[PDB]
Amino acid sequence: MKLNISYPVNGSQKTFEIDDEHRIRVFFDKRIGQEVDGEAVGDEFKGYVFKISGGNDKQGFPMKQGVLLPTRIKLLLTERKRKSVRGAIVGPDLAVLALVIVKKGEQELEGLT
Amino acid sequence: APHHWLLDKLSGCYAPRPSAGPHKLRESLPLIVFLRNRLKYALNGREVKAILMQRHVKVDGKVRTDTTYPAGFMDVITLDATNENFRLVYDVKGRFAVHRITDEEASYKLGKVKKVQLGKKGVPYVVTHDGRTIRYPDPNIKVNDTVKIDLASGKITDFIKFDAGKLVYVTGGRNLGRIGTIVHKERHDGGFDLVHIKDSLDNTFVTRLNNVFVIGEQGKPYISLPKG
Amino acid sequence: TVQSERAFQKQPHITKRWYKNAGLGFKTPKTAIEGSYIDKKCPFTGLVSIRGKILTGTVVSTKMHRTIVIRRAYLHYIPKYNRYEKRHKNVPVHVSPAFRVQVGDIVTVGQCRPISKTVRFNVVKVS
Amino acid sequence: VLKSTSANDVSVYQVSGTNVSRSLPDWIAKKRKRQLKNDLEYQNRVELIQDFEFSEASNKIKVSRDGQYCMATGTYKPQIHVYDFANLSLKFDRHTDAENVDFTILSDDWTKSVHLQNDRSIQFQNKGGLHYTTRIPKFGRSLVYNKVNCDLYVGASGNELYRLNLEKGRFLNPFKLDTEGVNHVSINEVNGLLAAGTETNVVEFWDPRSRSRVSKLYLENNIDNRPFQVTTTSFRNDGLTFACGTSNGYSYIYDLRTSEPSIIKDQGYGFDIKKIIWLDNVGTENKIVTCDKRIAKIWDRLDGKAYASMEPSVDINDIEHVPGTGMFFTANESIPMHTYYIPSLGPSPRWCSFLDSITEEL
Amino acid sequence: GISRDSRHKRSATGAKRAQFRKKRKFELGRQPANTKIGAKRIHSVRTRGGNKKYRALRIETGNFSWASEGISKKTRIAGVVYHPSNNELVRTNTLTKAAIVQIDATPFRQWFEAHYGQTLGKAKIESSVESQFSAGRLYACISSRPGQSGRCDGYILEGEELAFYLRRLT
RNA sequence: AUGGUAGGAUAGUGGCCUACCAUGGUUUCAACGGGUAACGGGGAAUAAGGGUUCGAUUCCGGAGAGGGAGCCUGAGAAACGG
RNA sequence: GCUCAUUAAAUCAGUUAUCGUUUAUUUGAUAGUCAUGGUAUAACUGUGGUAAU
C-alpha cells in the first residue's frame, strides 16, 4: 500500500508506494494515534517516529478514529443517515495508510524534508 | 365576495382578500376597494401601490401603507390631497358608505369598548373595537360604551354610558345599521340581549347587544351622520 | 362527612370559607357561606364561571352522586303538518350540595366550561 | 482505556459509561469546533462502542443468545433500543406508549418482543410495528415466559397469579397468591419450579404440570433489623441450587432439597439486592453476581469472597450477561450506558476480539 | 402517541365506533416521567412550537414553604410517604401533586435559632410538629406539577391538615 | 356506559387516560338498530330582463402516495418532493 | 398537488363559549434597578484514496 506521509514542521507532504510485505507488516494491527518506528520498515527511515493519522481502504471507506473492528461496518452517521464505515485498525485491505512524522532521525528524504 | 363592498361581479375573477389588522375581516373594507373601486381614484391594482408609497393617504392619524389594509366601521381616513377627510359609515341597505367630514370632525372618532379590566401595577384600561387600548380611563367608562378619541394622542375627551333612550347605531346582525335610539334592553338565555330599537317611523327592530354602538343621545348624534 | 375521600379536600382560595358571587341575580345561599362542603366545581365558593346558557327545566332523576338529570320538555312546531309535537330533552347536570333536590324540583342552571363529558351546566337555582 | 483497581488485586476494565466522554455526540457542531480549538488527542484515545448516547437510563437490559444482540428499554420518549454487535449501532428503535417494567425476549434474536407496561398490559412486538397489546388485572414488576407449556405467566402485587398461554392465546385457571407478595418470577431450567418474592419472604414453587404449589421456604436472619422481602431470585442452569436476594443486602443461597439452611453474605450498603445471575456458563464457574443499587459484586458460592467489586459512580438498576464472557450490561442513571468487561473472568467475544488487546498492552 | 379523540368511545345513548378519521397531531398526548429522588436531571420538551414544558425525572432539591411563619426555605428531599391516587408511586418513591414526603428539618431549624434565640423542643408552635423537629424529618406535601414545571415545590403540613394525614400514616 | 374525587397527559377543558368511589345513562316525545344507487344534497352562491322555473360556481365525506411501524423540524404536518 | 376506497346528530349550516385554549405575521399599549470581551465556520495552500456520490 501507499504511505501518505506528511511533515507538518515544514508543512510538506508526500506519498510513497510500498510493495514489499516486510515493510507493511510493522503497521499491521496498529491503530491511529500509535507511535511507529519505520526503521524496521526501511533503512532510510532510520530513527524516524511515525504516528498513524488516517487514510482509506480499497473501496474509499475511511478509517474513523477509534471505532473498533478492522473489518467494515455500517454506522448511523451525521439529520443523520447510515453509511458504511471501515474500522479504526490497520489491515492488509487498506489501499493507503496516511501517517504523520513525530520524531526525526538521521537520514533525509528529498521531497519530504 | 361579500355584500358590503359594492363591487361588481365583473372585472376580474379573484376577490382582493383583506389583511389582518385592527378590524374584523368580515367587518373590514380593504383600501384597494376603497381607492380604485368605489372612490374611483385609481384604475389598476398597481396604481393603488403608487399612492400608498408616496403616503398620500393616512387612516386614523397613522401613515397606514398597505394595499389590503382593513378599514372598518367609523374610521377617519384623511387624504392629504384635496384637503378632504373621509369617514366610513355603514349604509342601511347592506353596504358601506364613504362620507365627507370636516377637519375638526376628522380630529375625533367614536369607539365601542369591548372589554375592560385592571392592568398591571393597578392601572385601569379599556379596549376599543378598533383595538386601541388606553391606559387610565374614567371608571365611569364601562362595557359597550362609546369613547371619543383625540387622535393627536390616544386620550379620551368624551364618554357616553349605555343607558336606555339614546341614539344607537347597529354593527351586526340582520337589522344591522340603523338609527332608532332605544326601546329598552331585553334579557334572554345565554345572554343574547336584544336591545330594542324604534326608528324614525317608530318601528321595533331587534339585534344583539354585541351589535349595539351608541352614536349619541336622544336627539343629538356626536358625529355628522350622512343625510339623504 | 366532609373528609371522606382519599385526598384532603380544600378550596384553592384563588372565616375558613371563601365566597364569591356567580352573578346575574343568583344570590349566595346560607349553605354556601356557613356550610361544610368544599365542591371546587360549585358556582359559588368554587372554580367555575357561569357564562353561556342560563336554562330551566324539571329534575327527573337524582340517584347519582353529586349530579342530577334535568328533563326539558317543550313543544315542536312542524310547518308541513301545521301541528305540534310534545318533546323533552333529558340533560344531566352537576348539582352542588346547597340545593335540596329530589324528583320534581324546578331548577335553573348555567353554562360552566364543560365539566364532565356531558355536563355543561351546574345547578344555580332550585324552586 | 482507563483501568481501575477494585482493591481486590483483580484489575477491572470498564468502558462506555461515566468515565468515557464522547466530545463528538454531534460532529456537525462540536467536532468542527474541535479542530481549531483542540488537538483532540484525548478524544483520539477515547474509543466509543456501538455509537449511542442514550438518556433516561433503562428499566431493563437484555441480550439475545444468538446474533450478539441487545435490548434496551428507554424512558425519555419511552422507547425500545435494539443493538447489533456486528454493526455497532441501532438496528431497531421503536417508541413505546408506557414504560415496560420488565422485558422478556421470545426464544432468540428478537423474533418477537414481550413487554410489561406501566399500564396493566403486555405489548406483543414483532419485526413489524406493535403487533398486539394485552391487558392485565394487576400491575407488573416481572414476567417470565417458559418454553415448556407455551405459557407466559405474570404477576405483581396481585391476589391471583395470572396464567396466560401463548398457544390458543388465552388465560384460564389462574393461580393464587399467599398474602400477595409476588414481586419476582423465576423458573428452573431443568425441572421447571416457580420462584416468588414475597413480603413475608416466601418462595412459592408452583409446578405447572401439577397446577399447584409445592412448598414454602422462609428466611431468617442473625441481625434481622426490619421486615424484609426478597426482590429478585434466580435458578442455576444446572437446576441444583437457588439464589435469593433480599431488600437489606443479605445474599441468601438455598438448596433444592426442600431444606431451610442457607449462607449469608451482605453488601456494605445493603440498600437492595438488585439482580442475581449464576455464572455457571463461564469458566472458573460456580460464581454468582450480587448487585446493590450501586455496588455490584461477583463471588465464589462455596468460598464467599470478593473476586471483583463493580462500582460505577452513577447508580444502576440492571445487570445483563453474555455467556462465556465477562460482558456486563448495566443501566447507569445517565446518558451513557456503562457496560464493562473483566478479562480475568473470561475471554472477550468475537466482536470484542480486538477489545481484549487494547487494555493489557495499553 | 396518546390520542384524545372522543369519537371511538360510545355515545350517551350507545352509538359507537365510527372511525371517521385517523389520529392527528393536535389531539396529542405524551408520556409521564415517573420522577424519583436523586441527582437532578432536567428534561426538554418543545410544545406547540413556541412553548416548552419541563418533564421531571430525578429531583434532589426543591422549594418548600413553612406556612405558619410564612417563610420559604429550599429543601433537600429524602423520601415519599403518602399519595392518594395510587400507592404504587410511594413504594417506588414517585413525586406528583399532593404527595406526602419527608424532608430535612435542619434548614428550618437553622432559621429558628439565630433569628430568635431558642432550640426545637429539647416562640411557640404546635406540639405534633415540635416532636418532629427532634426527629430531623418533617412531613411535607407537594403543590406543584413536576410533570409540567419540573420543580418539587409544595407546602409543609400544619393545622388540621396535619391531623388528617398523620391519622392515615398510623 | 353515568358521575364523583385525586393524579397524569395536553396549548388547554375533559373518563381524554388510570386509580378509588357510587349504578347510572337514552327511550313510544322512537332511543338504539337497519336501508341510503348520501352523482344525492347544501339560497353555499349569484343566476335566466318570457328557454316557465335554465345556468355556472363552491361544498361533498374519508383514506393514500410500494406496504406496515417508530421519529425529527416548524405558528401550522403526526409532511411520503425527511 | 393528484389518485384510491362511501359517512345519518356525524358532516354541514348558522350560532355561541372561549373567565377552557395556542398563535409567525397585523395593529394598539407598555420596562431607570467598554475607542469595543472571548470565541468561532470555511474558502483557500498543497497530498491522496475510491469502479463510483
3-state secondary structure of D142: coil
Phi, psi for B146 (deg, rounded to 5):
-90, 160
Interface touch E2/D97, C-beta < 8 Å: yes
Is E39 an interface residue toward D (CB < 8 Å)? Answer: yes
- CA proximity to B210, closest of B225, B188, B182, B191: B191
Optimal mutation site among C1, C8, C116, C119, interface E, most CBs of chain E within 10 A: C8
One domain for residues E26 and E52: no
CA D287 to chain E, closest CA, distance in angstroms equals 31
- The CA distance from B142 to B139, in Å, is 7
One domain for residues E24 and E39: no
Cβ atoms < 10 Å from Cβ of D106:
17
How many inter-chain contacts (B to C, CB under 8 Å) are there?
Answer: 9
Compare CB distances from E31 to D55, D77, D315 and report the shortest one's residue.
D77
Which residues are CB-contacts of D78 (< 8 A; sequence separation ≥ 6)?
A: D95, D96, D97, D98, D99, E31
Give the strand pairing for E154-156 and E61-65. parallel
HSE-up (13 A, CA, CB side) for residue D360: 11
Q: Which of residues 190-209 of B touch C (CB under 8 A)?
A: 190-191
Resolution in A: 3.8
In angstroms, the Cα distances linking A103 to A109, B27, D161 are 14, 83, 72
Compare CB distances from D26 to A33, A78, A89 and report the shortest one's residue.
A78
3-state secondary structure of D184: coil
- The CA distance from E104 to E133, in Å, is 9
CA–C1' span, C95 to F5, in Å?
A: 15
One domain for residues E23 and E74: no
- The CA distance from B63 to A21, in Å, is 84
- Whether B134 contacts B153, CB under 8 Å: no
Tracing cell 422481602 back to the chain, one arrives at D229
Is E46 an interface residue toward D (CB < 8 Å)? Answer: no
CA–C1' span, B55 to G15, in Å?
A: 42
One domain for residues E89 and E158: yes
HSE-up (13 A, CA, CB side) for residue E146: 28
- The CA distance from D310 to A111, in Å, is 54
CA B165 to chain C, closest CA, distance in angstroms equals 23
- Whether D76 contacts D114, CB under 8 Å: no
Which residues are CB-contacts of C65 (< 8 A; sequence separation ≥ 6)?
A: none
Phi, psi for D277 (deg, rounded to 5):
-125, 130
DSSP letter at C27 equals P
How many inter-chain contacts (C to E, CB under 8 Å) are there?
Answer: 13
Tracing cell 426543591 back to the chain, one arrives at E62
Among protein residues, the one whose C-alpha sits closest to the C1' atom of F20 is E85
Interface touch E84/C6, C-beta < 8 Å: yes
**H or E segment to which residue E78 belongs:** strand E72-82
- The CA distance from E40 to E57, in Å, is 8
C-alpha cell at A25: 507488516
What is the residue-wise DSSP string for B121-148?
TTEEEEEETT--EEES--TT--TT-EEE
CA–C1' span, D177 to F19, in Å?
A: 22
3-state secondary structure of B38: helix
DSSP letter at A39 equals T
CA dihedral for B122, B127, B131, B136, sign (positive or negative): negative
Residue type at B103 in one-letter notation = D
In angstroms, the Cα distances linking D129 to B102, C62, D113, D148 are 74, 48, 11, 27
- Whether E127 contacts E33, CB under 8 Å: no
How far out from the chain centre does Cα B65 lie? 19
One domain for residues E55 and E75: yes
Phi, psi for B37 (deg, rounded to 5):
-100, -45
- The CA distance from B100 to A56, in Å, is 83
* Helix then strand then coil, % of chain D, to nearest 5: 5, 35, 60
Which residues are CB-contacts of D9 (< 8 A; sequence separation ≥ 6)?
A: none
CA–C1' span, A11 to F21, in Å?
A: 82
Dihedral, CA of residue C69, residue C75, residue C77 and residue C78, to nearest 10: 70
Number of residues that make up chain E: 170
- Whether E97 contacts E145, CB under 8 Å: yes
What CATH number has the domain bearing residue C87? 2.40.50.1000
Which residues are CB-contacts of B136 (< 8 A; sequence separation ≥ 6)?
A: B123, B124, B125
- CA proximity to D299, closest of D315, D279, D283, D275: D279
Among protein residues, the one whose C-alpha sits closest to the C1' atom of G18 is C113
What is the residue-wise DSSP string for B162-225?
--SSS-EEE-SSTT-S-----S-B--BTTB--BB-EE-TT--EE--BGGGEEE-BSSS-BSS-P
C-alpha cell at D251: 445474599
- Whether C10 contacts C2, CB under 8 Å: no
Phi, psi for E27 (deg, rounded to 5):
-100, 60
Q: Which domain holds residue E45?
A: 31-105+137-170
C-alpha cell at D131: 403487533
- Whether D113 contacts D105, CB under 8 Å: yes
In angstroms, the Cα distances linking B194 to B115, B212, C53, D71, D275 are 19, 9, 15, 68, 75
CA–C1' span, C88 to F26, in Å?
A: 12
CA–C1' span, E1 to F64, in Å?
A: 21
Compare CB distances from E58 to D99, D139, D333 and report the shortest one's residue.
D333
- The CA distance from E114 to D332, in Å, is 42
Dihedral, CA of residue D338, residue D343, residue D344 and residue D350, to nearest 10: 130
Burial of residue B80, with CB atoms counted within 10 A of its CB: 0-12 exposed, 13-18 middle, 19 or more buried: exposed
Alpha helices, H only, chain B: 31-32, 45-53, 103-107
One domain for residues E41 and E14: no
CA dihedral for D161, D166, D167, D168, sign (positive or negative): positive
- The CA distance from D60 to D48, in Å, is 22
E121: left (phi over 0), alpha (psi -120 to 50) or beta: left
CA B152 to chain C, closest CA, distance in angstroms equals 38
CA D34 to chain A, closest CA, distance in angstroms equals 14
One domain for residues E4 and E61: no
In angstroms, the Cα distances linking C52 to A107, B223, C122, D146, E18 are 97, 35, 12, 61, 30
Contacts of B190 in chain C (CB under 8 A): 52-54, 111
CA–C1' span, E18 to F62, in Å?
A: 11
In angstroms, the Cα distances linking E96 to A45, D132, D324, E157 are 70, 31, 44, 16
How many inter-chain contacts (D to E, CB under 8 Å) are there?
Answer: 26
- CA proximity to A69, closest of D348, D352, D44: D352
Give the strand pairing for B84-91 and B76-79. antiparallel
Cβ atoms < 10 Å from Cβ of D83:
26
DSSP letter at D29 equals I
Cβ atoms < 10 Å from Cβ of B102:
11
One domain for residues E98 and E149: yes
Burial of residue D13, with CB atoms counted within 10 A of its CB: 0-12 exposed, 13-18 middle, 19 or more buried: buried
Phi, psi for B77 (deg, rounded to 5):
-110, 100
- CA proximity to D75, closest of D324, D325, D317: D317
One domain for residues E11 and E91: no
- CA proximity to B58, closest of B35, B38, B80: B80
3-state secondary structure of A24: helix
Contacts of B189 in chain C (CB under 8 A): 53-55
Optimal mutation site among E10, E96, E141, E164, interface C, most CBs of chain C within 10 A: E164
One domain for residues E72 and E82: yes
What is the residue-wise DSSP string for D201-256?
-----EETTTTEE--------SS--S---EEEEEE-SSSSEEEEEETTSEEEEEET
Neighboring chains of D (3 or more beta-carbon pairs < 8 A): A, E
- The CA distance from B128 to B144, in Å, is 9
Is C89 an interface residue toward B (CB < 8 Å)? Answer: no
CA–C1' span, E20 to G4, in Å?
A: 17
One domain for residues E2 and E57: no
- Whether E51 contacts E40, CB under 8 Å: no
Contacts of C55 in chain B (CB under 8 A): 189
CA dihedral for C50, C51, C57, C58, sign (positive or negative): negative
- The CA distance from A1 to A16, in Å, is 9
Parse chain A into domains and list their residue ranges.
1-113
**H or E segment to which residue D42 belongs:** helix D41-45
Is C108 an interface residue toward B (CB < 8 Å)? Answer: no
Alpha helices, H only, chain E: 88-91, 106-116, 127-135, 159-169
- The CA distance from D172 to C71, in Å, is 46
Q: Report all structural domains of chain B as residue ranges with CATH numbers, in order of start.
A: 1-104 (3.10.290.10), 109-159 (2.40.50.740), 162-228 (2.30.30.30)
CA C43 to chain B, closest CA, distance in angstroms equals 16
C-alpha cell at D19: 468515565
Interface touch D333/E38, C-beta < 8 Å: yes
- The CA distance from D104 to D186, in Å, is 12
* Helix then strand then coil, % of chain B, to nearest 5: 10, 30, 55
Cβ atoms < 10 Å from Cβ of B225:
14
Is E38 an interface residue toward C (CB < 8 Å)? Answer: no
Domains contained in chain C, number: 1
3-state secondary structure of B214: strand
Q: Which domain holds residue C65?
A: 1-127
C-alpha cell at E137: 424529618
Number of residues that make up chain D: 362
Experimental approach was cryo-EM
Burial of residue D194, with CB atoms counted within 10 A of its CB: 0-12 exposed, 13-18 middle, 19 or more buried: buried
- CA proximity to C101, closest of C126, C119, C121, C122: C126
- The CA distance from D136 to D141, in Å, is 12
Among protein residues, the one whose C-alpha sits closest to the C1' atom of G39 is D37
Phi, psi for C88 (deg, rounded to 5):
-160, 160
Which residues are CB-contacts of A61 (< 8 A; sequence separation ≥ 6)?
A: A72, A84, A85, A86
Residue type at E26 in one-letter notation = F
Interface touch D333/E39, C-beta < 8 Å: yes
Tracing cell 376599543 back to the chain, one arrives at B128
Tracing cell 355515545 back to the chain, one arrives at E11
One domain for residues E24 and E79: no
- CA proximity to D331, closest of D3, D76, D45, D12: D76
Q: Residue C23 forms beta bridges with which residues?
A: C26
Residue type at C86 in one-letter notation = K
Give the strand pairing for A12-17 and D132-133. unpaired
Contacts of D314 in chain E (CB under 8 A): 39
Chain A residue whose CA is closest to D30:
A78
Tracing cell 467536532 back to the chain, one arrives at D31
- The CA distance from D329 to D332, in Å, is 10
Tracing cell 354585541 back to the chain, one arrives at B210
Tracing cell 477489545 back to the chain, one arrives at D355
Contacts of E147 in chain D (CB under 8 A): none
3-state secondary structure of D358: helix
